[PDB]
Structure formats: C-alpha cells, structure tokens
Chain A
Amino acid sequence: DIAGLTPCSESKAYAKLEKKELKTLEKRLKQYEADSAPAVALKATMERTKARFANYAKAGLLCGNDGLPHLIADPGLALKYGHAGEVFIPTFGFLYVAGYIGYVGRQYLIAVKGEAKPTDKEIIIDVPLATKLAWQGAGWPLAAVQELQRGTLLEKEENITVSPR
C-alpha cells in the first residue's frame, strides 16, 4: 500500500506476534488452578490481547516487515487511502483541547488583572470565576478568530524591550 507497507490484516508477522504473545500468556497461565484469581486475571489479559489485535486489524492499520502498526502523517495521502483517524483527526482533537486550555487561562488572566489584587487571585484561585470561564470556553475558536479580527488579540508596542529594542 503506502510506502510498500502491507495491511496488518494481511501481514504474517502481525499474526506471528499475536500468537507469540498468546503463547507467553498461556505459558504463564498453565501453572495455576482452573477457577483461581491468577487464572481469571490471565484469561482477561488474553481476552484483551485478542480484542486489541482484532481492533487493530479491523481499523485498517498498515504493518511493516516486523508486524507493527505504522501511522501516516500527510493530510491528503491519509484522506485518500483511509488513514485519517490516526494523525489528522487526533491533531484537530488536540488543537481543540489545547486551545481550550489556553483560552480559559487567558480569560482568567484578563479577568483577574482588573482588580486591586491580581497576584492574590493568581495564588488563591477564584473558583466560581474559574468554573464560569471553564464552561464558557467551549466556543474558544470562534471567540479566538473574533478577537483576532478586531485587533484585541494582540498587545501593541507598549511591551517591555531592551535598549536596542
């Protein structure tokens, strides 16, 4: 497929690694009783192992010459060959939650600078104001591009600089 990588459902070293991990787990299993708690724990481990290999072969992952899932990081190649759920959807999910955190922190800072004790609100957190901004920060990309388009996202050159600027 991409870069000479076989799919994991077609790869043989993938099945070999699955069989090898099941073999290690059953070699650890065969020295206990039938209905004992280590036996139940190792059977749950084997169940999760089989379910994980079935889920990785189900999702269309690409395996290499060693039988391990490889990820594709190019928007067009992954959207073309159906690999968008491994980098592209995760990178926009991360940018949503990271900009969430940053926008809530920025709104807390601008909310506490307008008082007689900004540092005292920085040490001891105003919990109702923090929860209010935490719930209101779900529309952070819209509010971010609106603050970008008004010129209120940036401070002007009233910033602190050195004598050679």
Chain B
Amino acid sequence: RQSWLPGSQIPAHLDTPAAQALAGNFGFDPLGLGKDPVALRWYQQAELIHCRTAMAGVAGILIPGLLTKAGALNVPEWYDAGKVAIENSFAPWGSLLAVQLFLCGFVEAKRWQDIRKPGSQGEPGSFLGFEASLKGTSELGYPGGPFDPLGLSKEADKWADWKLKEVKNGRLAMLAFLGFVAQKYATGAGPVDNLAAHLKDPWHVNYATNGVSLPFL
C-alpha cells in the first residue's frame, strides 16, 4: 500500500485492520509512538483536534492576509492582530482568557469524557434536550447531530474520501502554521510578504540567504 517511503518496511502496529482503516495511514511512525493501541487511539484524537484547529487558525492567517493585499479588509499581521484587537476591544486580555478557559473547558471536558467512554454523553437526564444528540457516530473523533449540520456525513460512499481530505488538509495546515512561526522569527515580515519575496527573486530570497536557518554558510 501507500507509504511515506517507498521501500521502507511498514511498522507492524500501523499494518493491522484497526490501523489501516483509520485515515491517511502511510506507515509513518519511525519513533514507534503508536505501538500501544490505546495510545494510538489517543493520538488519533490529538491529531484530529490539532488538524481542525490548525486549519481554522491558518485560514484566519491567510484569508485576511490575502485579502489585505487586495482592496478591502485592512487587517494587521497575525503577530500584531492581538494587540490591535485588544486596543479596539472592551475587556482586558486576562478576563477574555478566563472566559475562554471556562467555555473551552466545558466543551473539552465533554470531549474528554466521550474519549474515555464512547457511549457516555447520551445519559438521559444529564442534558435538557441536547443529551440525545451528544453521542458519537460509531467512530470516535467524528461526532454527529448538531455537529455536521449539512448532513454530508450520511453518505457512505464519499466518507473515506472526506476523512482523507480532512487529514491531508489538516496535516498541511499544521506545517503551514509552524512555517508561519519560523518565517516570523527569521524574517520579521508577513507570510504573504514572504511569498511575494520568493516570487520576486526565487534564486536569491530563501532560507539559505536569511542568515538564520543555517548559519554555517
């Protein structure tokens, strides 16, 4: 099957019927972190959450960052947006961080207890009316009900394709955000400015010339 290295041997824990059918399996565990199946279940969940919040974050970087080079949406840089936003806001940042810690803690603890038991949040009485729509959809990490409003998860023949598009765009958005961080430290300009500088002179403006990434040259 498909692998991250054609020719390397696939590890025995990623070549099982419980692992081959997950999403985006390419036999990539050179550190052997997923040998414990409970650990692989937990790491599947951590990967899905990092994928989804990395896509949402990198979209919040790029689409305001692309449209600010167009006409509308005078938006500051992402390493400057929190300061301008807290100058425009109504609350200090500590109060807003406390509110988001309570609001995220409730939701994350719901997801926590649904990881610990799959049939957990469907207790009758536990919720006013959201208790019957807070179960899973037989595959943990992929909930239904109020999550997924448009009903696209219902169709079974598209479903592995939807999963694999999600995991590829998510891993790619994780690389995008780590590149946003490193590009921010090495250059000091925005990522669209880095893309414009690589398009203006590709053979002279890259990470071999920034003087930071490999300083032995």
Interface residues of A (CB under 8 A from B): 135-136, 138-139, 142-143, 146, 150
Contact = CB atoms under 8 A, between A and B. Distances in A.
A139 B28 CA distance: 14
17 contacts: A135-B30, A136-B30, A136-B31, A136-B32, A138-B31, A139-B31, A139-B32, A139-B33, A142-B33, A142-B39, A143-B32, A143-B33, A146-B36, A146-B38, A146-B39, A150-B36, A150-B38
Contacts of A136: 30-32
Interface string B18-61: 00000000000011110010110000000000000000000000
A117 B143 CA distance: 52
Contacts of A146: 36, 38-39
Given A136-B32, A138-B31, 15 more contacts: A135-B30, A136-B30, A136-B31, A139-B31, A139-B32, A139-B33, A142-B33, A142-B39, A143-B32, A143-B33, A146-B36, A146-B38, A146-B39, A150-B36, A150-B38
Contacts of A139: 31-33
Interface of B: 30-33, 36, 38-39
Contacts, number: 17
A47 B31 CA distance: 44
Q: Which 4 A-B pairs have the closest CB atoms?
A: A139-B31, A139-B33, A146-B39, A136-B32
Contacts of A138: 31
A150 B42 CA distance: 13
Contacts of B33: 139, 142-143
A71 to B, nearest CB: 26
A80 to B, nearest CB: 15
A146 B46 CA distance: 15
A136 B30 CA distance: 7
A135 B31 CA distance: 7
Contacts of B39: 142, 146
B35 to A, nearest CB: 8
A136 B13 CA distance: 15
A138 B32 CA distance: 10
Contacts of B30: 135-136
